[PDB]
Amino acid sequence: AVIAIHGGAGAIQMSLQQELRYIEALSAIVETGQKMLEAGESALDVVTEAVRLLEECPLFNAGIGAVFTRDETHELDACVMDGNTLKAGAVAGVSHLRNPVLAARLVMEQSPHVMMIGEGAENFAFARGMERVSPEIFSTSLRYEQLLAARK
Amino acid sequence: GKAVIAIHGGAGAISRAQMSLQQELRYIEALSAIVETGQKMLEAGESALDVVTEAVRLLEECPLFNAGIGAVFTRDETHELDACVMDGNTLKAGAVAGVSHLRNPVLAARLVMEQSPHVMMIGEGAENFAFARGMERVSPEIFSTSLRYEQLLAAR
Amino acid sequence: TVGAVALDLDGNLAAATSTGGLTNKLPGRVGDSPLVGAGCYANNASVAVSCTGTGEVFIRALAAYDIAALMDYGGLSLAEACERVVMEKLPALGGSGGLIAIDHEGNVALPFNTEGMYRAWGYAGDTPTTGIYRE
Amino acid sequence: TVGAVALDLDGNLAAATSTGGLTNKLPGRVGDSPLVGAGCYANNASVAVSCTGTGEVFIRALAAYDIAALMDYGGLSLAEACERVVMEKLPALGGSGGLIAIDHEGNVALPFNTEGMYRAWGYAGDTPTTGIYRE
Ligand SMILES: [Cl-]
Ligand SMILES: [Mg+2]
Ligand SMILES: [Mg+2]
Ligand code: NA
Ligand code: NA
Incomplete structure (x- = not known):
């Protein structure tokens, strides 16, 4: 029994102490996931919680710390798949759901559908008690600066 | 290999014990006219990508088929259309989902493939991308048919 | 749902799918068609x-x-891959429907596990075939 | 993008991906993450x-x-399949990135063709490994 996680690949400049924020984040999340597996938690709950924690963590391009669209908005995408049932749930283009991976899980668990998009996705979630949030909550200085840099 | 087209207008419990011969022949002549148009293009050296785009455009236009004109209704009595096209040569693909203001989703899909760096666009974003590339905006009601509305009422 | 697959005189393959989805569908639901x-x-x-x-x-x-993967990696023929996918794996998961397929070698297949599939095919220069039901 | 893959003590596999997408994307753009x-x-x-x-x-x-298909049909190991996909096929199409994979027997792989991939892994009852750069 085992977990892996990622916080995105690309052109990774940096001091050790900068690097260690990413390392301590990754370490704490993989360890949370490790403890759940050891305690007999399901693979599906473990990957949901790890990705929920990676969403919450503003260092990573998912939930809080999402990149910006050309219109300086956030549009978030998530998927979760159960290799046992081959059930999957997915949301795309959602701006008002704090934890897209939880929305994805809801689509898997409390619809017969695999993928939901946009306001349809959001209304489905709201209808099952998931909270509405304003897209501003994902916004960070670092991703905005990267948007300005992408423009030139 | 030797040039060829196949098309479909959906699989399901199409039952003989509901359809008349006259209803069945409308479906056969539809399918026949579209596969023949696609056959003429292939014979004329048109590309598989142009041929599948036109065939699906014709299937969208035909109100007998649950795509573009003659699309089913959602729970909210709206239309929400989806399309994909893929080029086996480049492995490029373009796709729209959740579009209500584009007459021919497969043309929007082609546009995503040909005139964006993206493969998939959804919803109002998909539509705004298409409008900004000069694709015409249409009323969602143009896809609405009496047949599909009645089927909605029968489902509920 | 509607679809097209073609193999051209250049030996190029392409595929397209369009749909309005399911009658009474939950708004924002996406099926396989655009994916x-x-x-x-x-x-x-x-x-x-x-x-x-x-x-x-x-x-x-x-x-x-x-x-594609059954043919390319599994060494299945189009016919084998179509049977495997449509008649075994999709029913296995409670999936009903079918598909249209043409391979790089110009084989055409129109498998469905349903009562009907509105379908047609034709070789360039040949008479086309149409179908609704099984047989 | 972020991700998680796990194999549990019942021998079950799951995967999750979440993302803001690509910086400066057209509104309405969908990448691989929810697909x-x-x-x-x-x-x-x-x-x-x-x-x-x-x-x-x-x-x-x-x-x-x-x-999945290279392993299941091609008979590749996870390592072989990861190398083939990330180091050959994705670059061949001008794709840059990586992924995390666990197979049904608990082999773990974290391939990337980029400068870095923020990653970690750890067997239950073992100490976890973290990484940013290559190796
Ligand atoms: Cl490192
Ligand atoms: Mg042409
Ligand atoms: Mg209609
Ligand atoms: Na985050
Ligand atoms: Na139509």
Whole structure:
């Protein structure tokens, strides 16, 4: 029994102490996931919680710390798949759901559908008690600066 | 290999014990006219990508088929259309989902493939991308048919 | 749902799929139709596929690319891959429907596990065939 | 993009992907992350995969399921399938990125063709390994 996680690949400049924020984040999340597996938690709950924690963590391009669209908005995408049932749930283009991976899980668990998009996705979630949030909550200085840099 | 087209207008419990011969022949002549148009293009050296785009455009236009004109209704009595096209040569693909203001989703899909760096666009974003590339905006009601509305009422 | 697959005189494969989805569908639901390798796939190395049916299962089973992967990696023929996917794997997951497929070698297949599939095919220069029911 | 793949004490695989997408994307753009078999896949018969990178290439290459299909049909190891997909096929299409994969027997792989991939892994009852750069 085992977990892996990622916080995105690309052109990774940096001091050790900068690097260690990413390392301590990754370490704490993989360890949370490790403890759940050891305690007999399901693979599906473990990957949901790890990705929920990676969403919450503003260092990573998912939930809080999402990149910006050309219109300086956030549009978030998530998927979760159960290799046992081959059930999957997915949301795309959602701006008002704090934890897209939880929305994805809801689509898997409390619809017969695999993928939901946009306001349809959001209304489905709201209808099952998931909270509405304003897209501003994902916004960070670092991703905005990267948007300005992408423009030139 | 030797040039060829196949098309479909959906699989399901199409039952003989509901359809008349006259209803069945409308479906056969539809399918026949579209596969023949696609056959003429292939014979004329048109590309598989142009041929599948036109065939699906014709299937969208035909109100007998649950795509573009003659699309089913959602729970909210709206239309929400989806399309994909893929080029086996480049492995490029373009796709729209959740579009209500584009007459021919497969043309929007082609546009995503040909005139964006993206493969998939959804919803109002998909539509705004298409409008900004000069694709015409249409009323969602143009896809609405009496047949599909009645089927909605029968489902509920 | 509607679809097209073609193999051209250049030996190029392409696939397209369009749909209005399901009657009474929950707004924002996406089935296999717009999803690369679920409802639509084309690769000159393998096959062009377009799918129709219970879109959730076509996504979970990645029906279109699975034909491609069964042929390319599994060494299945188009016929074998179509049988495997449509008649075994999709029913296995409670998936109903079918698909249309043409491979790099110009084989055409129109499998469905349903009562009917509105379908047609034709070789360039030949008489086309149309179908609705089985047989 | 972020991701998780796990194998549990019941021998079950799961995968998850979440993302803000690509910086400065057109509003309405969807990458691989929510697309089953593009950015996220899990099958007890093969592997659990979560992807990060050029989402358009991950969709076109159906990166996640291709790992599953190379293992299941091609008879590759996870390592071979990961190398083939990330180091050969994705670059071949101008795709940059990586992914995390666990197979049904608990082999773990974290391939990337980029300068870095924020990653960690750890067997239950063992100390975890973290990484940013190559090796
Ligand atoms: Cl490192
Ligand atoms: Mg042409
Ligand atoms: Mg209609
Ligand atoms: Na985050
Ligand atoms: Na139509």
